[PDB]
XYZ file of C-alpha atoms in Angstrom:
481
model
C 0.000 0.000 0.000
C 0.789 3.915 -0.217
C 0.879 6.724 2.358
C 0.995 9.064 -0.639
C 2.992 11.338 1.352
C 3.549 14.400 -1.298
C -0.016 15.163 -1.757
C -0.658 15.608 1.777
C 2.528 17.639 2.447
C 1.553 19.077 -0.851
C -2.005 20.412 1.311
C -0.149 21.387 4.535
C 0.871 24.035 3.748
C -2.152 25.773 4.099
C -3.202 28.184 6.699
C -6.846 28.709 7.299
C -8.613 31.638 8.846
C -10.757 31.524 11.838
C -14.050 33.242 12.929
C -16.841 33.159 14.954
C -19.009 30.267 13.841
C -22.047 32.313 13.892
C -23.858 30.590 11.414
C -25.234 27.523 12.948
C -26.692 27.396 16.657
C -25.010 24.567 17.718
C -22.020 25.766 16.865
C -21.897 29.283 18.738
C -18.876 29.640 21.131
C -16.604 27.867 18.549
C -14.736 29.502 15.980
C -14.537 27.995 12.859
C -12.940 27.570 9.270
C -12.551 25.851 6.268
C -9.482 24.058 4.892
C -9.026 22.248 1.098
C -7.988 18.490 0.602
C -7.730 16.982 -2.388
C -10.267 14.467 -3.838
C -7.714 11.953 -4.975
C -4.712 11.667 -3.031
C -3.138 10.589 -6.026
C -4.186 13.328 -8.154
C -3.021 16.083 -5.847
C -3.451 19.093 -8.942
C -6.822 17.667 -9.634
C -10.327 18.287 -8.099
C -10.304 19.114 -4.490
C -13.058 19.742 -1.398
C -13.741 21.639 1.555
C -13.875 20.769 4.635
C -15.075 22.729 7.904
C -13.341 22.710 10.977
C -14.141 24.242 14.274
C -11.920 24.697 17.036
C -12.164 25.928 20.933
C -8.783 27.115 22.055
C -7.317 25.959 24.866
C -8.493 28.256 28.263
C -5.548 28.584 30.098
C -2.538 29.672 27.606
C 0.223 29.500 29.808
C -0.653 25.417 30.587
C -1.055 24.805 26.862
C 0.090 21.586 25.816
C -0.951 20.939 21.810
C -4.623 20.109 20.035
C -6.838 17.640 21.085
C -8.323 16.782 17.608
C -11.930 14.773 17.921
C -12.664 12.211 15.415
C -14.907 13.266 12.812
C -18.144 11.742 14.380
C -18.895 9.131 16.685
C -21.276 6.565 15.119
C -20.602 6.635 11.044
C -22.818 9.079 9.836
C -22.675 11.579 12.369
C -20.954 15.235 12.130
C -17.797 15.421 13.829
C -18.440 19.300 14.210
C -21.087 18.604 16.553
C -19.341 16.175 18.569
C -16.708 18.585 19.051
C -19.331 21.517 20.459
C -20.821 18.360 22.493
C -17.292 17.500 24.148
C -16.589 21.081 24.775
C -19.820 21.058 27.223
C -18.835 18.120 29.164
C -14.758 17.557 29.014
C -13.116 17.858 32.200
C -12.153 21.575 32.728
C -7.912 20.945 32.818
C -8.733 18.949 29.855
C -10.168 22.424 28.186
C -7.432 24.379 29.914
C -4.693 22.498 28.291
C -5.878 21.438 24.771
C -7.076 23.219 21.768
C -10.205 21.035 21.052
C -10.679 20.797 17.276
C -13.448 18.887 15.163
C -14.313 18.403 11.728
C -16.982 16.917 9.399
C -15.573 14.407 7.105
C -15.940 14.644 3.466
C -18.716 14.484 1.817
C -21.585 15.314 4.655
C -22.261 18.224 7.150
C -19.819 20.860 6.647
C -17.678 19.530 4.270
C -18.516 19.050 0.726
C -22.159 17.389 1.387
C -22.896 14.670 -0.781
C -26.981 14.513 -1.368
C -29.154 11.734 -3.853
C -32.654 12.507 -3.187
C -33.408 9.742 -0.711
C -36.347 9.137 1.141
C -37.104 8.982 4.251
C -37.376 5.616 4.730
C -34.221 4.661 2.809
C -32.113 7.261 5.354
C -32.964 3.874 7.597
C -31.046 2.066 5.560
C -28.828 0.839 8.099
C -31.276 -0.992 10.663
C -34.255 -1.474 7.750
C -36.545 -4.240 8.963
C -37.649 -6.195 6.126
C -41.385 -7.293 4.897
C -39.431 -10.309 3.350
C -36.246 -10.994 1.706
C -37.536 -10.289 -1.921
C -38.648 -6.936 -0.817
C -35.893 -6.361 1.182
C -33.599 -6.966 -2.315
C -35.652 -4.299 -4.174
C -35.673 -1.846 -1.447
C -31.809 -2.121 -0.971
C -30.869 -2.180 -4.576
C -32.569 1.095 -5.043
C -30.962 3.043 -2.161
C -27.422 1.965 -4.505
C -29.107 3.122 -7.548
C -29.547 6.819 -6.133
C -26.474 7.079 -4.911
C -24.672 5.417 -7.894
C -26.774 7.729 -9.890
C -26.228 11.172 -8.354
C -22.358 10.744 -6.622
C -20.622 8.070 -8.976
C -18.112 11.264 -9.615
C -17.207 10.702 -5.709
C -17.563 7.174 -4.862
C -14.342 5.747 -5.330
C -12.669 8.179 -2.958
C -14.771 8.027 0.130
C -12.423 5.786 2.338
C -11.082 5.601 5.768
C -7.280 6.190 4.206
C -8.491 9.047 2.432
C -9.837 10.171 5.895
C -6.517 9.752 7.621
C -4.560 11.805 5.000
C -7.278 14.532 5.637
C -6.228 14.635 9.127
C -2.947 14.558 8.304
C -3.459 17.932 6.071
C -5.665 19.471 9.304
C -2.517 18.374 10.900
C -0.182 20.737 9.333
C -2.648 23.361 8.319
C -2.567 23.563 12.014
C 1.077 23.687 12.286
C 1.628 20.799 14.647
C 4.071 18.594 14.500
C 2.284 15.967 16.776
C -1.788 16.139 18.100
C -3.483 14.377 20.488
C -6.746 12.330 19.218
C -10.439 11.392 21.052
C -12.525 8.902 18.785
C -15.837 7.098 19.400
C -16.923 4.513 17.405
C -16.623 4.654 13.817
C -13.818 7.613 14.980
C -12.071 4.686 17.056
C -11.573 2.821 13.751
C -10.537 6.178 11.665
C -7.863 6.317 14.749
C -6.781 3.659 14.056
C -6.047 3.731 10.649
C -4.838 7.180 10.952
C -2.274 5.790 13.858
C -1.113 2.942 11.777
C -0.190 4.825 8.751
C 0.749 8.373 10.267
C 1.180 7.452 14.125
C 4.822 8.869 14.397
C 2.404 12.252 14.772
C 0.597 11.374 17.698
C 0.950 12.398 20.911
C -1.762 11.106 23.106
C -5.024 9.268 21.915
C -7.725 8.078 23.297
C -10.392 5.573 21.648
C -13.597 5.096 23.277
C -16.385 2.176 22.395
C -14.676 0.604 20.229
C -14.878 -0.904 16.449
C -13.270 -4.200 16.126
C -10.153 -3.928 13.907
C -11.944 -7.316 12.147
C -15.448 -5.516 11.727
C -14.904 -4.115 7.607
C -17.470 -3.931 7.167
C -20.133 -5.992 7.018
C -18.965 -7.398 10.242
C -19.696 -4.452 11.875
C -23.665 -5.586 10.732
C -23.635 -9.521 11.638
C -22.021 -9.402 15.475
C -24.507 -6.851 16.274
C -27.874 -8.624 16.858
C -26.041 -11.012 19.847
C -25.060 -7.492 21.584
C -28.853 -6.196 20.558
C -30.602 -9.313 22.170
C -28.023 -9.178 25.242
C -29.122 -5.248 25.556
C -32.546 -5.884 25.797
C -32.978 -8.436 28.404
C -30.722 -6.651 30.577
C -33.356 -3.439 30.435
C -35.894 -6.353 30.705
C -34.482 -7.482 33.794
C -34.100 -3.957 35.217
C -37.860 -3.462 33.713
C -39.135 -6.610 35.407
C -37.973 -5.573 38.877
C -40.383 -2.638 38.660
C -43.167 -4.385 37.713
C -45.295 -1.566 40.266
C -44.268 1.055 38.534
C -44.179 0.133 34.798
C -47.072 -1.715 33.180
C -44.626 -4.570 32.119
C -44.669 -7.758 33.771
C -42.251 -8.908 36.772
C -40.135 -11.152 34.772
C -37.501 -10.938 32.147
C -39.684 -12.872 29.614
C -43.192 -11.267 30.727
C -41.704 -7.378 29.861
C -40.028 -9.223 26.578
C -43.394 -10.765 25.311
C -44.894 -7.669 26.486
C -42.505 -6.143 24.247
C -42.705 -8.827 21.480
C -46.546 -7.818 21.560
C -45.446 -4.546 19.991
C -43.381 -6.121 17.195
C -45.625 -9.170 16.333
C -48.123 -5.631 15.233
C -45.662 -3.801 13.149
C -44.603 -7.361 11.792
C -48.229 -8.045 10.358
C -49.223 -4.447 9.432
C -51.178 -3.813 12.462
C -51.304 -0.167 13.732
C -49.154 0.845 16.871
C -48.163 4.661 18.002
C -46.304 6.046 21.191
C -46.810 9.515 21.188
C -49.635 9.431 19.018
C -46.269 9.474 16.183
C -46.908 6.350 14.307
C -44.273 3.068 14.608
C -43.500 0.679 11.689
C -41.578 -2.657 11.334
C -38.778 -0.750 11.712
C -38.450 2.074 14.277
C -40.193 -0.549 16.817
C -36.871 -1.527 16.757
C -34.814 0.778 16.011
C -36.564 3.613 18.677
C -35.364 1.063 21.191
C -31.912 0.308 19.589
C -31.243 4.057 20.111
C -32.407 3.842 23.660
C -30.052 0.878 24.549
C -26.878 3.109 23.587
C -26.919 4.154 27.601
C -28.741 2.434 30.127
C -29.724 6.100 31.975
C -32.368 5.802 29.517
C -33.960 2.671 30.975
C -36.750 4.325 32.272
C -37.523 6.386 29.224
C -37.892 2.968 27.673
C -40.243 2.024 29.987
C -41.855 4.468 29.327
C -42.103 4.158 25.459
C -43.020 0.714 25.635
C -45.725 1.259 28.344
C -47.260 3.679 25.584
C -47.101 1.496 22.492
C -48.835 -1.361 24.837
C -51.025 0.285 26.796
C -51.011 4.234 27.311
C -51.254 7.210 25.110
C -49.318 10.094 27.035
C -45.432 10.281 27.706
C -43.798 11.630 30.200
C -42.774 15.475 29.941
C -39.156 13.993 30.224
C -39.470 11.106 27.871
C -41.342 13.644 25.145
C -37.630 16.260 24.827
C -35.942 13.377 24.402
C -37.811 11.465 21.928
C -38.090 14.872 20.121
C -34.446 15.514 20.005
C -33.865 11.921 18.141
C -36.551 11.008 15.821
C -39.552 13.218 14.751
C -36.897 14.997 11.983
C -35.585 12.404 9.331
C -31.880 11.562 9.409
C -29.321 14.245 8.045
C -29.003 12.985 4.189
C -25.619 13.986 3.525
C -24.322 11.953 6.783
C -26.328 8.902 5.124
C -24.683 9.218 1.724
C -21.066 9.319 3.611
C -22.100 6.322 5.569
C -23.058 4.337 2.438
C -20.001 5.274 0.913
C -17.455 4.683 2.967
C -19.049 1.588 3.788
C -18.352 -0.113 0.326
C -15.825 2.470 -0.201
C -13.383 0.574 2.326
C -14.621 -2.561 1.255
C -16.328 -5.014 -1.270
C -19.628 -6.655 0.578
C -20.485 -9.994 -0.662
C -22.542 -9.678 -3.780
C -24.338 -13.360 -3.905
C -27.902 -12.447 -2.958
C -28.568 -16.070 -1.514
C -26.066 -15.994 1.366
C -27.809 -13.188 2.813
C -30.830 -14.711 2.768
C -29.976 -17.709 4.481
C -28.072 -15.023 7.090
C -31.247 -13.053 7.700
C -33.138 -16.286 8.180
C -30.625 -17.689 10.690
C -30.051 -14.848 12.437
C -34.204 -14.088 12.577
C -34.584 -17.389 14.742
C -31.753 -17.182 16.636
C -31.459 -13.320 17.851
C -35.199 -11.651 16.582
C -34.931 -8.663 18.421
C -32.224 -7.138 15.387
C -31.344 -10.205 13.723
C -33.191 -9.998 10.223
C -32.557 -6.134 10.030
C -28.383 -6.948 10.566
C -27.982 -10.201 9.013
C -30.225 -9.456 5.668
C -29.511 -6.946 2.415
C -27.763 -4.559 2.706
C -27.058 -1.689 -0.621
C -23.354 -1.545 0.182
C -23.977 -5.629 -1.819
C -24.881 -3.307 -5.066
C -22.604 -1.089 -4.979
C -21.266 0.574 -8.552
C -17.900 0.982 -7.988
C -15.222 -0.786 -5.942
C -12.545 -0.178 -3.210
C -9.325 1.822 -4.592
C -7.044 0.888 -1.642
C -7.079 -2.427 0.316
C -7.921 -2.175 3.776
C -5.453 -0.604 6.012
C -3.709 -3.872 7.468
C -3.561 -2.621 11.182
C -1.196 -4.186 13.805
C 1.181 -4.326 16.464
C 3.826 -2.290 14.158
C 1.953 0.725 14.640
C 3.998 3.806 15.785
C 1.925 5.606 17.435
C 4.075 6.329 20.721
C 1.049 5.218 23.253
C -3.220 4.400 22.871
C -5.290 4.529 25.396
C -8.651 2.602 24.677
C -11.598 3.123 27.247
C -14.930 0.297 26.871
C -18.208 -0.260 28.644
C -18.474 -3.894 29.733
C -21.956 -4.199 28.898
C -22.191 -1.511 25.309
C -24.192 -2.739 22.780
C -22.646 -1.772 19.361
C -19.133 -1.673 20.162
C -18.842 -4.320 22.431
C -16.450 -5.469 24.803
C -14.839 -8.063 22.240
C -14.290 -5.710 20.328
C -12.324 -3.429 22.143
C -10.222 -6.091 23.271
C -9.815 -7.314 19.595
C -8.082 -3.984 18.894
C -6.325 -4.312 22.230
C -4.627 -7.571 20.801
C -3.880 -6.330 17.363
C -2.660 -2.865 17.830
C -0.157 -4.639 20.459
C 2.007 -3.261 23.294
C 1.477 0.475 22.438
C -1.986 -0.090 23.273
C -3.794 -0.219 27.046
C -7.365 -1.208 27.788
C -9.612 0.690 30.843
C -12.736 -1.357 30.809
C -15.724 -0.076 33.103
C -17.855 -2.372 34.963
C -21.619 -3.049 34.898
C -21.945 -0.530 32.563
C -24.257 -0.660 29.233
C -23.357 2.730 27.567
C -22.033 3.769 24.612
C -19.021 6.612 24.597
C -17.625 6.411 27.990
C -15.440 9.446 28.589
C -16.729 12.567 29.723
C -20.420 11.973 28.909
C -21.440 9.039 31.360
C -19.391 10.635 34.056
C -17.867 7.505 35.268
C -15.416 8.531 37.782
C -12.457 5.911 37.203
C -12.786 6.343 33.702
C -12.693 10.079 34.312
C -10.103 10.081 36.462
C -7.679 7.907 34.552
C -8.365 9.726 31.208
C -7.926 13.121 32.637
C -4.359 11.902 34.267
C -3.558 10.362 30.461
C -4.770 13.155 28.247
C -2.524 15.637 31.232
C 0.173 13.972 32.965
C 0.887 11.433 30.396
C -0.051 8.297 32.609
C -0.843 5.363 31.194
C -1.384 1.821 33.785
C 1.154 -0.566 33.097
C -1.700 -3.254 31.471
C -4.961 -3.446 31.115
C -7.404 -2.247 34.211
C -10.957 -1.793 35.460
C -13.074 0.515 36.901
C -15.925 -0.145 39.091
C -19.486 1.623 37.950
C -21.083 2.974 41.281
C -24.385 3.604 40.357
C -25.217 0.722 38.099
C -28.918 0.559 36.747
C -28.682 -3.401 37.673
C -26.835 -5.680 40.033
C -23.678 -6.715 39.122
């Protein structure tokens, strides 16, 4: 494989300029600017983008130690902008003090050169799509490629991971920096580590948090997920079940699940179910409660949800902001089109349409909670054009002077395999902080774990890393250990 090395030193050279990102709420107390990358690394005089970054600025001057760059998103699909203003809310204050904090969107969404097909709604769901049957499930697939391979063929080939990692690389030294510091989630944990493996002499300190197995690309990523989904579940059954007096679901495990398998067996044969009076198909019955089980705070909110597509009509005041905040708007197109692209721009999905029908059938008997909607057709299996790198090969060779990599025991979509996956293969550079009784998704700052916390903060300041691989107790787990 190739770093292609002079484009991107070709591209650093740049110097943005910085204002007041005024023009997006979100976004106010940042400053931001915009910075140009190439298309094709390998055509460095050819057709280039934009990206935007924003930036903080670290709060106390005189303790300032380098940038902090965030990944460009947690979950694939995501803006990386808006993680950034989230993180500057909730990072620990000598964190702020010390680092420049800078975020970006990748290319081709948000910010930065958004990519846009015309989909609908329903194809934006792409991802966790619950199908009628398999046949159906083909067509519906297929066609989410063909609007994509109709309106950003121009594009496709070039949305990639490694193309990613060279565009940090030219943030890099558009910022001047010899070394920066990295915080991933998710999809970002993966982009850090490709990023590390090919460029990792510039690191100073990362952190990757809920991770994405190294052996996940991509389709992977799909297939382990309905175990984790069905373990999710009928842990917030159990927690449900206890509290039989206060929620209308039964008082054991299986009693709040069939209560809950109630509300599927509807969507599942057409038959009418709402929550907030907002209506529920065969696909957000799931996928509403998916989004739930990324933190187990939100237990009760799905108690509540489920109560009301059994029984009830109102929500809870609570339970209403936060519904409102996720669904209720469809899901940001451009951050869809990136998704599907990088996707099957990393990688080439199996194309035989049979093996993923005997997949989704397995996987509905064995796991039904997700299992169809994971295991089945997916449009990344029709997609127009193929990979133009191999995947990065990541391993214990990478020079990335120290990773710290933080994981919720109990997570859901990056589970703790996973994270101990890309403990063995990035090797001896590489420590793992795993936190206890704990079903959440991005650990550090947001659930406010103190361990995790605690050892982060003395990482991402004073350099300290534990000799091997620790834990941290949870102390106010929503279940017994």
């Amino acid at each position: 494989p190739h770093l292609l090395t002079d484009a991107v030193r070709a591209f650093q050279a740049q110097s943005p300029v910085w204002r007041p990102a005024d023009d997006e709420e979100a976004l106010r107390g940042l400053e931001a600017a915009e910075l140009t990358v190439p298309l094709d690394y390998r055509a460095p005089a050819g057709r280039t983008l934009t990206l935007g970054l924003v930036r903080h600025r670290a709060t106390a001057p005189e303790r300032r130690r380098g940038v902090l760059l965030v990944g460009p998103g947690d979950d694939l699909g995501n803006r990386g902008t808006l993680l950034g203003a989230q993180l500057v809310g909730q990072l620990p204050k000598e964190v702020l003090a010390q680092y420049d904090v800078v975020a970006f969107d990748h290319r081709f969404m948000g910010r930065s050169s958004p990519v846009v097909c015309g989909l609908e709604p329903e194809e934006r769901f792409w991802v966790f799509h619950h199908p009628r049957d398999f046949d159906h499930e083909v067509r519906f697939q297929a066609n989410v490629a063909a609007k994509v391979a109709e309106h950003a063929l121009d594009i496709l080939p070039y949305a990639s991971s490694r193309n990613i990692a060279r565009d940090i690389e030219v943030i890099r030294g558009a910022l001047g920096e010899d070394r920066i510091s990295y915080l991933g989630y998710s999809y970002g944990t993966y982009l850090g580590a490709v990023w590390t493996q090919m460029f990792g002499e510039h690191a100073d300190r990362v952190v990757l948090d809920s991770i994405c197995s190294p052996d996940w690309v991509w389709r992977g990523l799909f297939t382990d997920f309905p175990p984790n989904g069905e373990r999710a579940l009928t842990r917030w059954a159990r927690w449900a079940a206890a509290r039989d007096a206060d929620l209308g679901l039964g008082a054991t495990d299986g009693a709040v699940r069939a209560a809950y398998d109630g509300v599927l067996a509807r969507v599942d044969t057409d038959r009418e179910v709402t929550v907030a009076g907002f209506p529920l198909d065969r696909t957000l019955a799931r996928l509403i409660v998916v989004g739930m089980l990324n933190s187990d705070r939100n237990y009760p909110f799905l108690g509540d949800i489920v109560r009301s597509a059994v029984h009830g009509g109102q929500l809870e005041p609570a339970t209403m902001g936060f519904l409102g905040q996720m669904f209720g708007q469809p899901k940001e197109e451009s951050g869809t089109v990136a998704q599907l692209a990088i996707l099957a721009g990393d990688w080439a999905w199996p194309r035989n349409v049979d093996l993923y029908e005997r997949d989704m059938e397995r996987a509905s008997r064995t796991h039904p909670f997700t299992g169809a909607a994971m295991a089945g057709i997916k449009a990344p299996a029709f997609w127009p054009v193929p990979p133009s790198e191999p995947v990065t090969r990541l391993g214990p060779d990478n020079p990335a002077d120290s990773i710290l990599l933080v994981q919720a025991a109990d997570d859901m979509s990056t589970p703790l395999a996973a994270a101990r996956r890309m403990r063995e293969v990035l090797g001896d550079t590489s420590r793992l902080l795993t936190v206890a009784d704990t079903a959440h998704h991005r650990v550090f700052p947001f659930y406010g774990n103190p361990g995790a916390d605690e050892l982060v903060t003395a990482y991402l300041v004073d350099g300290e890393l534990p000799a091997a691989d620790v834990t941290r107790p949870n102390p106010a787990p929503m279940v017994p250990t």
